[PDB]
């Protein structure tokens, strides 16, 4: 085991022992701790409430020196998620608060939950979603509920 592997094993154990609300995360298979799936639930009383959004987190060899990449494998409609599902957030950019020794998988996932709860507007990875959030919030909320339904298969 190298430094990345020991750290990922430790973070997985901690996430399992202390699960964040509405987040199920870990390696997809323990024979490769560099590829994780995280299921993130849209928080209750927010526009994506009860959506279940799967994301792949792909970790670099030198973790935790460098951040993972993260992409959703469900449809999304969000200012900070590219149309192809890639997540565009400051915590995942190499040195707002960017990747550093303080950061962790738990903080990545919590930051994504927060951005769902409160969509923000610096990045424009989805300009249509950025514009609808800014100017037609009621219509944004209608599409969010559709994204939720789709995430549940309903």
């Amino acid at each position: 085991a190298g430094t990345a592997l020991k750290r990922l094993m430790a973070e997985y154990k901690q996430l399992t022992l202390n699960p964040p609300e509405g987040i199920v995360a870990g390696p997809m298979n323990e024979e490769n701790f560099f590829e994780w799936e995280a299921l993130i639930m849209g928080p209750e009383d927010t526009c994506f409430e009860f959506g279940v959004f799967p994301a792949i987190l792909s970790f670099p060899l030198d973790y935790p020196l460098s951040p993972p990449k993260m992409r959703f494998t469900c449809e999304m409609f969000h200012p900070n998620i590219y149309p192809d599902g890639r997540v565009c957030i400051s915590i995942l950019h190499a040195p707002a608060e960017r990747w550093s020794p303080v950061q962790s998988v738990e903080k990545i996932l919590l930051s994504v939950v927060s951005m769902l709860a409160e969509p923000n507007d610096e990045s424009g990875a989805n300009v249509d979603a950025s514009k609808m959030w800014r100017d037609d919030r009621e219509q944004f909320y209608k599409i969010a509920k559709q994204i939720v339904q789709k995430s549940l298969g309903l």
Binding site: T16, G22, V24, G26, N29, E30, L39, M41, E44, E49, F50, G51, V52, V148, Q149, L152, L154
Partner: peptide, 28 residues
């Protein structure tokens, strides 16, 4: 416990989150 039980537990927790969310999304 072992790897395989952690993996089955993880997959069970994923299934359980979907079941939980579908109930909440369709309730009232």
């Amino acid at each position: 416990g072992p790897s395989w039980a952690r993996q089955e537990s993880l997959q069970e927790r994923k299934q359980a989150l979907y079941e939980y969310a579908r109930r909440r999304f369709t309730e009232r």
